[PDB]
Amino acid sequence: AEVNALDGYNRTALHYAAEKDEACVEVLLEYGANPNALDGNRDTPLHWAAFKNNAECVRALLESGASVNALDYNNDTPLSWAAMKGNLESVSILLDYGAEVRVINLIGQTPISRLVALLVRGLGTEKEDSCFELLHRAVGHFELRKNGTMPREVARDPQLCEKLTVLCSAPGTLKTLARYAVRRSLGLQYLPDAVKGLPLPASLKEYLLLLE
Amino acid sequence: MDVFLMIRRHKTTIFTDAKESSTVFELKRIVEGILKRPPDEQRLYKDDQLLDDGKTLGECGFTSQTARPQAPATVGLAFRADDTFEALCIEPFSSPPELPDVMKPQ
Amino acid sequence: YEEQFVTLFTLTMMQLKQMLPLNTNIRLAYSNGKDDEQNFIQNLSLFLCTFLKEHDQLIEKRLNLRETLMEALHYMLLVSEVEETEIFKICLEYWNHLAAELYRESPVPPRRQLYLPMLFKVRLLMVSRMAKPEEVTDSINLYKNMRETLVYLTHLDYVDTERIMTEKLHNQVNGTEWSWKNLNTLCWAIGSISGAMHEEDEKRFLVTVIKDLLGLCEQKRGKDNKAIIASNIMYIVGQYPRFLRAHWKFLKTVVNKLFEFMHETHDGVQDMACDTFIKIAQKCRRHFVQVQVGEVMPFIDEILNNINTIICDLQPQQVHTFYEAVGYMIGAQTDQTVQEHLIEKYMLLPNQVWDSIIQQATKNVDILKDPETVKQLGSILKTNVRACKAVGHPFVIQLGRIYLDMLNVYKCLSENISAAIQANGEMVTKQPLIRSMRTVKRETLKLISGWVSRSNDPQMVAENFVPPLLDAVLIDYQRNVPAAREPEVLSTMAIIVNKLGGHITAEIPQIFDAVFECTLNMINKDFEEYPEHRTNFFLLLQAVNSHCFPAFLAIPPTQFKLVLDSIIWAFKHTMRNVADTGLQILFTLLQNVAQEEAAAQSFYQTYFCDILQHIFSVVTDTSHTAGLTMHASILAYMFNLVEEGKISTSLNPGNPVNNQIFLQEYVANLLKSAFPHLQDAQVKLFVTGLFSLNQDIPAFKEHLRDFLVQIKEFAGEDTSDLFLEEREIALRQADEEKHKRQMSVPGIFNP
Amino acid sequence: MYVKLISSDGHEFIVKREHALTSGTIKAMLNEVNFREIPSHVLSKVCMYFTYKVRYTNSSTEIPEFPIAPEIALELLMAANFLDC
Ligand SMILES: *[C@H](CC(=O)OC(C)C)n1cnc(-c2cccc(Cl)c2)n1
């Protein structure tokens, strides 16, 4: 079959496999489905796997050379789609492949902004809180004050507004800034295997992976 | 606005801050507070270029956007010995080690 | 003859296989076939549905038929593909029957394993094409039937139901199935599930669905798509008040979002917004008055602070819905003092407008002759009415503020109406200014009736409220031209009497002297010329009779005679409701008059032979046989009263012969003149039965039934309608059993 | 007032005490401190970090990014671990 052929919806079969199950994704990638294949909006199979939170499908795609920072016409990365649902497993997998957290879509939203929005709407379980913690570790530091002011929705939630404003107003520890610079230098590769060769204490090797 | 400076001489380095409207003379007064060397026997250099104590740091070319905390303006310092000024000497910070291959640019 | 039914199906099913192979697209065949083909498909659907409804058990038992039955069920799915309302409805009835069967079997069992391996196909189908709920008849019918079918299927397997809906929602977010129709139908199905799942699974499911829908609301651009999506969201959320109570911050977000939609202008979004807001406030009312976890102040106070902004753009009926919703919230504050301050802040804006208008009126009453002034008074009173309805009794604090001014306005408007009529004739009615003043009058009476019906201090109402109301209203009602008589006056008087029983009794004479004779001559001709005044008049009469019978004794005897005459006319009336209320009033009066036997003898001697004549007239006419048992009961009552000797009198007019010996002659006379063909021996037998069963009300009813049945048999007329009163109750019994059944299953009834 | 930090290659950096106490390890350990294991190119950057962390603590304005060269990042990470910053 012309595995890279677009159907009439102009989606690749890999866009369906990434939404259903990792066995199909593996079959299509093994038969040379383009992991960067672009649908009618450009969104790759990896964006859909992240949005479906198909953690093992996201893995099976990234491990076969999907562009972890692929961009759609909005310039949403797959992390910008995982983070809008706060779904922890796919965010963690993307960050282990060095997905960039400091991305901004053309609307102007970063993944952290989208997650803070989800938390302000009170749909956040402990899973969203863990995801926000993981992103705050990954980013090193973030800012949400626009004109010194939290986005108007956040101001509706005083406990979250105080937490975020204090997190913003701290310059961040030098340790986490070093962690970010190291992760940035390792770049688009499987971090929890690239770090193993580094000359570091093993506790810092684990810290670089955001596990601490 | 603010200025953040590193004053350097041989092995020594002083971090300090000053107003742009301040003058090199009170910077020398700070040097006095730290090293107890009278102002007349210390001279200060902007690049390989010397200055006048009176001039305000602003006209020395220091500026807030020039002299961020995270990247201060370097100022050279020298003293008299036997009532004669030493040549300006500053040891480079030891060069960083080789960047590991796993970290090398793509 | 089980085997006959089995062989009939098996051989006909065999023959049907040669007709339609299972691979055939039945919907396509229906679309392209000649009319004979549509008829054939419809008859197949009817055959399968009715057979299985009766004998699925039979084919379930004959295990050797298992797969052939399974094959028939495959056709059942294919015929369910048909969209034609009637065939689809037949299939839906079969699926409803089956889902009820399997929910009964267990709310796996030995049989359910037959269907379960593909009932998910029924699920998918049912969810795919759900009929429109009243998201805003055949509609209600299909909607209800399918709601129960889907709730049953979910209670049978929650996991696959949630899976299917989340898959279809993703395929909407995917765009692969994006279409306004498919989104609407899917969100209808999601809302129709409401309450069938456990609260934790409901929480998970709605968290996923809300995240998906908010993602789609970001992805889709264009106001049209945005609005359809917004509406589906508001629907789903309104239907799940439990989830909103479990997630205070989400509720707060939803409410603020609705107050954003109240300033939108796209089509019906503002109406959907207000409807969802009121649907929430009714059900979450307590959460808005509690100080929730981490709140500094209760959200109700924020809403009343923002109120002036929130409604800046709403239409009048939308403003009324908003004020009603807030009324429901304030109605949860149990602290009388705090609720007082809430009510004062709440009504502050209407109170300000009212005060302004009243101040202009006292400066010059001429301001009342102004369409804007009267329309603002109308809308103000509409808001007050809705507030009173929602808040209940404590709204008295507001009512006592405006009460006297309100009646003064009422008085002035009545003068204008009277002046207009006397100036320009009765046609002035339906003139828009006249319609406006009449609307203000109706709203005043609706407000008073609402509060008094909700009030619970009869002494306070009788002291402070009633006397000004009666002064303002009664003489106005009397002297006005009939078109200028609001029937709401009668309703308000009825409500006051129903509440202030005894305390109002001193007023009943002036009430009747003002309204009775004036209104009766508007009503006692034909019908349809004043149906509202008629209905409210009989409601007034029944209320006053039941609570204040002594006023009939205190009322002057001429008007009491007129009352009796009106009751005689009423139950003699042809229309079911008029007849029934006449009978009820008559029986109530007869029960009352046996108490307080003072002047009861004059009553009996005056009215019994006339009442008795009219009741036997209507009985022998059999006009409304639906009254027969009531007739029997009241007939038995007199035959008790006379046989107990309560008459204590020679009731024969002015004559020595004692009661009962006269009455049996009177009834013989009327029966013989009714039925000259009926023998005196039969008269004696019948009347003996009457004076034997007078305490045996069911036997008395059966005896009367029999004697009328045999009159019809002599006439050769239909007897069966005499029995309507029986089968109606049997029908009602079945309906109540159905209703009682539905309460056993969560989610069939709306929250 | 001032506190003197010595690098392993013997450079001597003088900093304001209020800044130096930004380091937890400095706070525990102390007007002179001698580091046996930190090279001058790292420790100078660490003192830049102290000045930055002071000047932008509880910042109303948006905090500018701290520039780390990738070569010194790997040794700055350890030095910030040991110094508990
Ligand atoms: C849709 C965005 C929108 O504004 O629609 C326009 C006005 C037609 N949308 C995003 N989020 C919501 C939402 C969230 C919670 C509760 C409700 Cl009722 C709506 N709608």
DSSP C313-366: T--HHHHHHHHHHHHHHHTT---HHHHHHHHHHHTHHHHHHHHHHHHHHHH-GG
Cβ of residue C593 lying under 6 Å from some atom of ligand 1: no
DSSP conformation class of C427:
G
The answer to whether A35 and A44 have CB atoms below 8 angstroms apart is: yes
Q: Note the helical H segments in chain A.
A: 13-20, 22-30, 45-51, 55-62, 78-84, 88-96, 111-120, 126-139, 158-169, 174-186, 191-194, 202-208
Q: Which residue has the tokens 């601490």?
A: A212
**Helix, strand or coil, per DSSP, at residue C567:** helix
Cα C153 to the center of its chain, rounded Å = 30
Distance from CA of B44 to the nearest CA of D (A): 17
The contacts of residue C53 (CB under 8 Å, 6+ apart) are C94, C97
Helix (H) or strand (E) holding C11: helix C2-19
* CATH 3.30.710.10 is the classification of domain D1-85: yes
Cα D18 to the center of its chain, rounded Å = 12
Distance from CA of B16 to the nearest CA of D (A): 8
The CB density around residue A124, as the number of other CB atoms within 10 Å, is: 21
Cβ of residue C230 lying under 6 Å from some atom of ligand 1: yes
Which is nearest to D59 in space by CA: A141, A157, B73? A141
The answer to whether C414 and C441 have CB atoms below 8 angstroms apart is: yes
The contacts of residue C392 (CB under 8 Å, 6+ apart) are C331, C454
Which is nearest to A87 in space by CA: A36, A48, A46, A52? A52
**Helix, strand or coil, per DSSP, at residue A43:** coil
Q: Which residue has the tokens 């908003």?
A: C322
Question: What kind of experiment solved this structure?
Answer: cryo-EM
In this complex, the residue of D52, D70, D81 whose CB is nearest that of residue A171 is D52
- What is the position in ligand 1's atom list of the atom closest to the CA of C223? 8
**Helix, strand or coil, per DSSP, at residue C425:** coil
The β-bridge relationship of strands B42-46 and B73-81 is antiparallel
- The pairs formed by B45-48 with CB atoms below 8 angstroms and a separation of 24 or more are B45/B75, B45/B76, B45/B77, B45/B78, B45/B88, B46/B73, B46/B75, B46/B76, B48/B76, B48/B88
In whole angstroms, give the CA distance from residue C362 to residue C247: 51
What resolution (Å)? 3.3
The answer, for D40 touching chain B at a CB cutoff of 8 Å, is yes
The CB density around residue A206, as the number of other CB atoms within 10 Å, is: 14
Which is nearest to C275 in space by CA: C263, C258, C251? C258
In whole angstroms, give the CA distance from residue C377 to residue C381: 6
Domains of chain C: 1-105 (no CATH), 457-596 (1.25.10.10), 600-751 (1.25.10.10)
**Helix, strand or coil, per DSSP, at residue C106:** coil
**Helix, strand or coil, per DSSP, at residue B2:** strand
Cβ of residue C129 lying under 6 Å from some atom of ligand 1: no
Give CA separation, C253 vs A146, C480, C547, in Å.
Answer: 22, 54, 51
List subunits contacting chain D, requiring 3 or more Cβ pairs under 8 Å: A, B
Cβ of residue C217 lying under 6 Å from some atom of ligand 1: yes
Give CA separation, C747 vs C135, C151, C311, C750, in Å.
Answer: 17, 6, 34, 6
Distance from CA of A196 to the nearest CA of D (A): 13
3-state helix, strand, coil in chain D (%, to 5): 45, 15, 40
Cβ of residue C258 lying under 6 Å from some atom of ligand 1: yes
Q: Do A173 and D85 touch (CB under 8 A)?
A: yes
The token pair at C160 is 């696959």
Q: Which residue of A has its CA nearest to D53?
A: A171
The contacts of residue B7 (CB under 8 Å, 6+ apart) are B13, B14, B16, B27, B31, B44, B75, B76, B77
Range of the domain at B63: 1-102
The answer to whether A70 and A189 have CB atoms below 8 angstroms apart is: no
The answer, for D60 touching chain A at a CB cutoff of 8 Å, is yes
- What is the position in ligand 1's atom list of the atom closest to the CA of C253? 15
Per residue in A167-189, is it b (16+ CB within 10 Å) or e — as a string?
A: ebbebbbbbbbbbbbbbbbbeee
Cα A156 to the center of its chain, rounded Å = 26
The CB density around residue C588, as the number of other CB atoms within 10 Å, is: 15
- How many domains are there within chain B? 1
Q: Which residue of C has its CA nearest to A16?
A: C174
Which is nearest to C186 in space by CA: C253, C137, C232? C232
**CATH number of residue B61's parent domain:** 3.10.20.90
Specify which residues C161 forms β-bridges with.
none
Q: Which residue of C has its CA nearest to A74?
A: C219
Domains of chain A: 68-208 (1.25.40.20)
Instruction: Give the number of beta-carbon pairs within 8 Å between A and B.
Output: 15
Which is nearest to C25 in space by CA: C73, C70, C67, C82? C82
Residue from C187, C211, C214 whose mutation best tests the ligand 1 pocket (most atoms within 8 A of CB): C214
The Å distance, Cα C336 to ligand 1 centre, comes to: 37
Written as one letter, the residue type at A205 is K
Domain range summary for chain D, segments of one domain joined by +: 1-85
The answer to whether C332 and C292 have CB atoms below 8 angstroms apart is: no
The answer, for A181 touching chain B at a CB cutoff of 8 Å, is no
Which chain C residues have any C-beta within 8 angstroms of a chain A C-beta? 170, 174-176, 207, 210-211, 214-215, 247-250, 252-253, 256, 294
Which is nearest to A45 in space by CA: C179, C177, C174, C210? C174
Give CA separation, C528 vs C524, C531, C535, C580, C594, in Å.
Answer: 11, 5, 11, 18, 36
Instruction: From chain D, pick out residues whose CB is under 8 angstroms from the CB of A202.
Output: none
Residue from C226, C236, C258, C266 whose mutation best tests the ligand 1 pocket (most atoms within 8 A of CB): C226
Q: Assess whether chains C and D touch, using the rule of 3 or more C-beta pairs within 8 angstroms.
A: no
First to last CA, chain D: 21
Specify which residues B4 forms β-bridges with.
B17
